[PDB]
Amino acid sequence: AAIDKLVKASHLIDMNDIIREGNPTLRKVAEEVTFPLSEKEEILGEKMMQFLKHSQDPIMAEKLGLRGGVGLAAPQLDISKRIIAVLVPNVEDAQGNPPKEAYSLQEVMYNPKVVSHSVQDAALSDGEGCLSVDREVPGYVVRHARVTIEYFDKTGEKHRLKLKGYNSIVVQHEIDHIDGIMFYDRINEKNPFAVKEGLLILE
Ligand SMILES: [Zn+2]
Ligand SMILES: [Zn+2]
Ligand SMILES: [Zn+2]
Ligand SMILES: [Zn+2]
Ligand SMILES: [Zn+2]
Ligand SMILES: [Zn+2]
Ligand SMILES: [Zn+2]
Ligand SMILES: [Zn+2]
């Protein structure tokens, strides 16, 4: 099964492991994971984070042929489980100093959900890209500006977190995968760049 292939100790996730638009797995509602986690589910999360770290590293990305990512969802690996990884780096200053914190968000989340959110909407100015979609897709992907999420970590510990900005967008994008929703579902059908008043456009 897919999962067996992915959790092999020597196996590194690459783009040949990522399923693409058209595969039905991407449209299902993924199954909740139960605790305590199986070994496979723990390992899968670790491999998914490793994939993100590799995608962000100029060397490994080039070694393995990776498109950069800041989030990955298990359905994109053909695994219909509610497991996401997110890895959002902070940036250097103009002087080339590293940020105080490497990342603004770094988590492998089990059973994540949005529990509340702002009335306000937001969208990335640059639109969204998807590792599973090999097409140019223009437009504003209209999301909640701010969200409160719940999720469990690999140990079974429950977290409750509020997010805003880019990090809010990322998490939402990944939770959508485990509900079978694609980014372009949230692009206006008639004018991809329509702006309803009060939409927060994030640069
Ligand atoms: Zn592989
Ligand atoms: Zn482990
Ligand atoms: Zn590595
Ligand atoms: Zn709650
Ligand atoms: Zn609501
Ligand atoms: Zn995605
Ligand atoms: Zn929502
Ligand atoms: Zn459409």
What is the DSSP pairing of strand 71-73 with strand 200-202?
unpaired
- The answer to whether 144 is a known ligand-binding residue is no
Q: Which of 182, 149, 194, 131 is nearest to 26 (CA)?
A: 182
Q: Which of 118, 124, 120 is nearest to 137 (CA)?
A: 124
Ligand nearest to the CA of 54: 3
Distance CA 71, CA 80 (A): 16
- The answer to whether 54 is a known ligand-binding residue is no
What is the DSSP pairing of strand 121-124 with strand 200-202?
parallel
Cis peptide before 98 (omega within 30 of 0): no
Q: Which of 44, 112, 42, 106 is nearest to 70 (CA)?
A: 106
**DSSP code of residue 177:** H
Distance CA 113, CA 111 (A): 7
Distance CA 42, CA 24 (A): 24
Q: Which of 164, 155, 70 is nearest to 117 (CA)?
A: 164
Instruction: Report the 10 Å Cβ neighbour count for 173.
Output: 24
| Tokens linked to 32 | 């909740």
- The residues placing their C-beta within 5 Å of ligand 8, an ion, are 189
CATH of the domain at 104: 3.90.45.10
**DSSP code of residue 126:** T
Burial class (CB in 10 A: 0-12, 13-18, 19+), 35: middle
Report how far ligand 8's centroid is from the alpha carbon of 195 (Å). Answer: 16
Query: Going by C-beta distance under 8 Å and a sequence separation of 6 or more, which residues neighbour residue 178?
Result: 29, 30, 73, 74, 75, 81, 82, 83, 84, 112
Distance CA 167, CA 89 (A): 10
Residue 87 belongs to what domain range? Answer: 1-203
Which approach determined this entry?
A: X-ray
Report how far ligand 8's centroid is from the alpha carbon of 47 (Å). Answer: 32
CA distances (Å), 130 to each of 12, 26, 119, 183, in order?
20, 12, 26, 8
List of E strands, 145-194? 147-152, 158-163
Q: Which of 158, 35, 46, 186 is nearest to 108 (CA)?
A: 46
From 174, 189, 197, 203, active-site residue: 174
3-state secondary structure of 135: coil
Active-site residue flag, 107 = no
What is the DSSP pairing of strand 158-163 with strand 143-144?
unpaired
Contact in structure between 110 and 150 (CB atoms under 8 Å): no
Partnered with residue 88 across adjacent β-strands are 105
Ligand nearest to the CA of 172: 7
Please, what is the end-to-end C-alpha distance for the chain in angstroms? 41
Number of structural domains found in the chain: 1
Helix or strand (DSSP H, E) at 110 = strand 103-117
Instruction: Report the 10 Å Cβ neighbour count for 203.
Output: 6
- Give me the phi and psi of 177, to 5 degrees please: -55, -40
Distance CA 147, CA 172 (A): 8
- The answer to whether 130 is a known ligand-binding residue is yes
DSSP annotation string for 74-86: GGGGT--BSEEEE
Q: What is the resolution of this structure in A?
A: 1.7
Q: How many helices (H) and strands (E) in the chain? A: 4, 8
